[PDB]
């Protein structure tokens, strides 16, 4: 049964996340214990997001689709505009009902966008990642600088190299 379990894990995770972000296509990576830290006060602040980490592929998709609406420097900057973001990051929370998210779109599509159709709904600065002080440093599209923790140093590079592949490469189908 030990393998019949991991295939049920891909099923349950997927259609549980589909109810949160309705635009998943392919669940690419899942880790069981992540924690988010934010940078701003020249030091790390333990944010209230702790649970399973997941990186998926988004169905982008039906061009002209709305990024719909859910309900000072501490609050995140919700993405508003067209559904153009190619992959997703999600920490399925255990603290409170609202989960954690990061839209991960390649710089390959951003430079393709920002020059051809300069109708930017929201200012988007390309993403970058690194391995520093037992955390995965993530620079978001809306300048926000987050950091995600996982006990294993293997897992920390695992999520880094993937996040790095996603942004440095062109939209794929694995």
């Amino acid at each position: 049964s030990t393998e019949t379990l991991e295939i049920y894990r891909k099923a349950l995770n997927f259609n549980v996340i589909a109810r949160y972000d309705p635009k998943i296509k392919q669940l690419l990576f899942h880790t069981p214990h992540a924690t988010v830290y934010k940078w701003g006060d020249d030091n790390w602040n333990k944010l209230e997001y702790q649970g399973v980490l997941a990186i998926y592929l988004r169905d982008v998709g039906d061009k002209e689709a709305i990024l719909p609406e859910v309900s000072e420097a501490n609050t995140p900057h919700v993405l508003t505009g067209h559904d153009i973001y190619n992959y997703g990051l999600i920490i399925m929370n255990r603290i409170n009902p609202d989960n954690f998210s990061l839209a991960i779109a390649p710089n390959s599509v951003l430079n393709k966008r920002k020059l051809f159709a300069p109708n930017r709904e929201e200012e988007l600065e390309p993403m970058k990642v690194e391995v520093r002080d037992d955390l995965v440093m993530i620079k978001t599209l809306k300048k926000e600088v987050y950091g995600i923790w996982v006990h294993t140093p293997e897992d920390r590079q695992n999520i880094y190299e993937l996040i790095k592949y996603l942004l440095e490469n062109e939209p794929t189908d694995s």
Partner: protein, 221 residues
């Protein structure tokens, strides 16, 4: 940052369980799945998240005790329960080997909904709901009004509770809205604004049930 919706407040109990499964039970290292004592704690953990958030977001959902909620996870996702014994039978022999002190109290609210009733002890410089120890073969609602008679002196008079285990003590604080704010309460035994409490806890037992208590506030209005 990415705008994900709120599906808990609109989905089936079957689905709500599924979610909580992904949340607390299914995404865990094998160790926390091959051992009975461990998953019985993750059920403990998700039943509280259900009672303190899921039940409060979607009101069509029924109030579930760790007794029945486990029976429900076992039916919808029977892949996690491998062993032969029933959860009811197991979470008594194994999890409750961790012998808990059931403490019955209540989160008292006003008719206008703006203030909460918390008291400070003689020795303790900490604010909490009227909290005291239980007895033998007495309903959790009868021990609730009796402890609020011993520590404040006002019986109010069921399914609207807020369960949580804190260092070997099963706190099951009930929710009662509608008690006079002008009335004078005094201890019958020998020996604050909600607006003011939201801003105070944000700076990093009542210190843990802030968000479920905010959900009771967001809802009634």
């Amino acid at each position: 940052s990415l705008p994900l919706l709120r599906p808990f407040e609109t989905v089936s109990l079957e689905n709500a369980v599924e979610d909580l499964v992904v949340r607390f039970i299914l995404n865990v290292p094998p160790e926390d799945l091959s051992t009975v004592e461990r998953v019985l704690f993750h059920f403990e953990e998700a039943s509280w998240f259900y009672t303190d958030f899921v039940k409060l977001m979607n009101p069509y959902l029924p109030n579930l005790s760790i007794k029945s909620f486990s029976k429900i996870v076992i039916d919808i996702c029977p892949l996690i329960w491998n062993w032969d014994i029933t959860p009811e039978n197991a979470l008594v022999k194994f999890s409750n080997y961790k012998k808990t002190i059931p403490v019955r109290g209540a989160a008292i609210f006003n008719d206008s909904l703006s203030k909460i009733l918390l008291l400070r002890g003689i020795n303790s410089k900490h604010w909490s709901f009227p909290r005291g120890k239980i007895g033998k073969d007495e309903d959790d609602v009868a021990c609730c009004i009796r402890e609020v008679k011993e520590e404040t002196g006002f019986d109010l008079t069921a399914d609207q509770y807020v369960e949580r285990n804190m260092n070997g003590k099963n706190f099951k604080i009930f929710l009662v809205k509608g008690v006079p704010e002008d009335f004078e309460f005094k201890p019958e035994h020998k020996n604050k604004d909600f607006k003011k409490l939201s801003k105070a806890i944000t700076k990093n037992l009542v210190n843990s049930m802030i968000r479920p208590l905010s959900l009771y506030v967001k809802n009634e209005k």
